[PDB]
Design a binder for this molecule. Structure first.
Ligand code: W2Q
Ligand code: W2Q
Ligand code: CL
Ligand code: MG
Ligand code: MG
Lengths: 50, 140, 142, 45
C-alpha cells in the first residue's frame, strides 16, 4: 500500500517498508535494516494507480 | 494484452530519444529528453500513464529504466515492470526521421513528424493510432 | 464532435503550463513549456496531433496561438483553428489537484502530471480517459 | 509545397514554391516574386 523512498548519498534509496510515521522522522525497514529518516529526506508514495 | 508497453532509448545527432510502443497496435510515442536519466524516464512514464491504461512496461536493463525514480513512478501509477518490437520500431522511426529531417531545423520536430506519420498510416485497413483506440475501448 | 480541442496557458510558480482538453470527454493533457511562445506551442500541438484525431483547436487570441509557427503546424497536421468555459474551468480544476499533491514532489512538472493522471482516471461510472477512447473508437468503427 | 521565410524575425508565408536551389529559393508571396536564401526558408511538404 505504502512504499518509502529516502536518501542517506544523493542517490534515492528504496523501496522500503513503512514501519512508523512520526512528525519529524519516519521509521523504515530496507531489506533487514531498520532506519530512521527525517521527513524532509523521505518520500512515502502510495500505490495510487491500483 | 491491451496494457503492455515497451520502452527504449535511441540516439540521433547526439540527442536521446525515448520511445514507447503499444505492442498490440504498433502505436508509438517519442520524446527527446535532455539526459538519459531515471528522472527524465520517470517523468515520461507519468505522462504516458495519464493518457493510456499502462499496465506493464517491458524495457532492457538500462540504468535509467532500473533507477529508483522509475520504480517510484511505476509504483504510484500501478505499473508492473518486466526486464524485438521496440528494436524494429526504433529503426522504423529513424527511417521516417531521415526522410523528413531537412523539413525542420530541430531534430525533436522531425521526431514528432515521424511519430505522426507512423501512427496515421493505414495498412493498405487501419492505422496504429486507430488500433490502440479500438483495442482499449473494447477492453472497457 | 470527437475532434474538437481547447488549448490555453496557465501559470504556477512562474512556470507556463500548456493545457489541452478534449471537449466532448473532459480528457486533458498538460505540459510545462520553457516559454509561452509559438514554437513551444507548435511542438505541443505536433505531439498532440500524432496522439489523437485533432481536427479543430479553440484558443484565445494569445500571441503564441496566433503565431505563424502554430499556423504552420496546424496546416501540416490538417488542424483548423478557431478563436472559453471548458478550458477556463479546467485550468482551475487542474490547479486544485496540483495544490493537493504539490508537497508530494519536488518539481512542479511532476505534480502537473500527477494531477493529469488523477483527473483522467477519476470516474464520474465513466472516467474522462475512458470517454475520449470510447468517443473516438465509436467514430472509427462506424 | 509551402514556403515560410524571414525577410524582421517574424516568419512570413505561406508562399508558393517555384524553385529550390542549393543556396536560394524562388517563391511567390502574394503577387511578388521573392528570392530567399536556404537558411531563411522553411520548405514543408
Ligand atoms: C524552429 C521553427 C521555426 C519556424 C517554424 C515554422 C514555419 C514557421 C517551425 C516549424 C513549425 C511546424 C512545422 C514545421 C516547422 C515543419 C513541418 C511540421 O510543421 C520550426 C520548427 O520547430 C517548431 C516546434 C515546431 C522546426 O524544427 O523547424
Ligand atoms: C526529483 C525526484 C527524485 C526522486 C523521485 C523518487 C523517489 C524516487 C521523484 C518521484 C518520481 C515519481 C513519483 C514521485 C516522485 C512522487 C509521486 C509520483 O511518482 C522525483 C520527482 O521527479 C521525477 C520526474 C518524476 C519529483 O518531482 O519529486
Ligand atoms: Cl518524529
Ligand atoms: Mg536500450
Ligand atoms: Mg490564454
Amino acid at each position: 500500500n505504502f512504499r518509502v523512498y529516502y536518501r542517506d548519498d544523493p542517490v534515492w534509496k528504496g523501496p522500503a517498508k513503512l514501519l512508523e510515521k512520526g512528525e519529524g522522522a519516519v521509521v523504515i525497514q530496507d531489506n533487514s535494516d531498520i532506519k530512521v529518516v527525517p521527513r524532509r529526506k523521505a518520500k512515502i508514495i502510495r500505490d495510487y494507480g491500483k
